From a paper:
Here, we report that VEL proteins contain a domain related to an atypical four-helix bundle that engages in spontaneous concentration-dependent head-to-tail polymerization to assemble dynamic biomolecular condensates. Mutations blocking polymerization of this VEL domain prevent Polycomb silencing at FLC.
The equivalent double mutation of VEL1VEL (RK>AD) also essentially blocks polymerization. In a subsequent round of mutation screening based on crystal structures (see below), we identified four additional substitutions of conserved surface-exposed residues of VIN3VEL that strongly attenuated (R541H, R556D, L563D) or blocked (I575D) polymerization. VIN3VEL crystals also show protofilaments; however, these are invariably composed of dimers rather than monomers as in VEL1VEL. Indeed, dimers are seen in every single crystal, regardless of the mutant, space groups, or crystallization conditions. Interestingly, these dimers result from mutual domain swapping of H4 between individual VIN3VEL monomers whereby molecule A donates its H4 to molecule B in an adjacent VIN3VEL filament, and vice versa. To form filaments, individual VIN3VEL dimers either stack perpendicularly on top of each other in a “cruciform” fashion (in RR>AD) or they associate pairwise to form tetramers that, in turn, stack pairwise along the polymerization axis (in I575D).
Residue numbers in the entry:
A (entry chain CCC): 532 to 601
B (entry chain AAA): 532 to 603
Write the structure that this text describes.
């Protein structure tokens, strides 16, 4: 998920909620120094975010489909 | 709200849930044919996601600032 983690942090930062300095320090730390437990914990965060993000995708697709097909 | 919708769709794009066509197709509908209710529904879903991102933002910062900063 080393690509997935970049895409999550990027996503958070792109929409506000995280600043540039934190994103680049986070990704340096994640890639070089985070311990196996610390990588598990971040993986939970990204999984929560992936399920949040997918839910919203289905809402928007379903909203759009319902408006067109009705 | 529009900027939140566009940047959200990007976040959907990069993870590949959504097909390529959806962005232009959804934005054209959202901006040009969505009823007052459909527009409200779209903003409300996107605010509920923004609130998930804000909470997740703070939880990432609070949980890991020490481990990140301590190693310089």
């Amino acid at each position: 998920d080393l690509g997935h983690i970049v895409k999550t942090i990027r996503c958070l930062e792109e929409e506000g909620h995280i600043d540039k300095s934190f994103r680049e320090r986070f990704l340096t730390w994640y890639s070089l120094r985070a311990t196996h437990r610390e990588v598990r914990v971040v993986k939970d965060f990204v999984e929560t975010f992936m399920e949040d993000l997918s839910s919203l995708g289905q809402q928007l697709v379903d909203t759009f489909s319902e408006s067109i097909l009705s």
